[PDB]
Design an enzyme around this catalytic site. Sequence first.
Site, PDB file in Angstrom:
ATOM      1  N   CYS A 109      71.379  51.566  53.935  1.00  0.00           N
ATOM      2  CA  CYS A 109      70.053  51.342  53.352  1.00  0.00           C
ATOM      3  C   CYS A 109      70.134  50.950  51.886  1.00  0.00           C
ATOM      4  O   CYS A 109      70.763  51.645  51.081  1.00  0.00           O
ATOM      5  CB  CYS A 109      69.290  52.663  53.489  1.00  0.00           C
ATOM      6  N   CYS A 188      70.193  50.817  65.271  1.00  0.00           N
ATOM      7  CA  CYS A 188      71.204  49.807  64.940  1.00  0.00           C
ATOM      8  C   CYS A 188      72.577  50.179  65.470  1.00  0.00           C
ATOM      9  O   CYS A 188      73.460  49.300  65.492  1.00  0.00           O
ATOM     10  CB  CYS A 188      71.234  49.624  63.418  1.00  0.00           C
TER      11      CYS A 188
END
Length: 205
Positions: A109, A188
């Site tokens: 992130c 993911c």
Amino acid sequence: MAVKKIAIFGATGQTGLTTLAQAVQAGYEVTVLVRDSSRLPSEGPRPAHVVVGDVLQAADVDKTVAGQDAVIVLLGTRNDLSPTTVMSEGARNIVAAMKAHGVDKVVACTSAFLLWDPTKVPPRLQAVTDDHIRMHKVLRESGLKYVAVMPPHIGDQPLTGAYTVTLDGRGPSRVISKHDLGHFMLRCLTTDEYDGHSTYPSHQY
Ligand SMILES: NC(=O)c1ccc[n+]([C@@H]2O[C@H](COP(=O)([O-])OP(=O)(O)OC[C@H]3O[C@@H](n4cnc5c(N)ncnc54)[C@H](OP(=O)(O)O)[C@@H]3O)[C@@H](O)[C@H]2O)c1
Ligand SMILES: Cc1cc2nc3c(=O)[nH]c(=O)nc-3n(C[C@H](O)[C@H](O)[C@H](O)COP(=O)(O)O)c2cc1C
């Protein structure tokens, strides 16, 4: 071969805590690297393995990445907005440990500022954003399978699983709940469709 074992970095942060809880509830065998174990909760799902140490210490990172199938990175600086290299130096250690241990999937992130007009970052967030950019560069140049997750404002709305993921920073909103962001990082792990791409999760709550 599905991913089974993962390491999470930043598991005690806002998004990390719920990503950790979700990953354990989902069936993953989770290892976390934490500086201070008192920041992990007692109630709820619990990681399988806890390494006490620092992402800036290569040996600590190596211990955490050994044996894993994939890595989730939710490092950040909490409320500290000063000039910083913690995230990018941490990512350097993570990439080195992944390569040393044969791990080839990282979901990390940074922020939607890396998709938006790079001259519209609010001044007080510029220093952190510059380190997000360094971290993104480290991960994209590693050659590893890297999903870049670039969220907008992280909120505390409930988990929905119903958010939208775009590849360009445009979407239904400029907010993603921390719980939905964690859910997406786990998503993911079970697809390759975002490997090598930048992703923008958002939702109207
Ligand atoms: N807030 C927003 O709206 C927003 C929006 C878009 C992107 N982002 C970016 O999204 C990412 C995740 O944000 P967040 O709010 O979930 O994070 P956060 O609450 O800042 O948590 C940062 C995590 O990193 C860990 N950490 C920091 N330094 C470390 C070190 N030296 N060694 C090991 N772990 C370390 C922290 O550990 P401790 O618990 O030990 O402190 C904590 O687990 C951040 O990079 C943030 O900048 C935030
Ligand atoms: C793409 C994007 C990235 C952001 N990145 C950060 C960040 O790294 N740190 C942060 O404190 N706020 C960031 N924000 C917004 C903050 O989370 C927001 O100012 C927060 O509500 C401030 O709350 P506080 O005063 O309780 O810290 C971001 C917003 C967007 C749209």
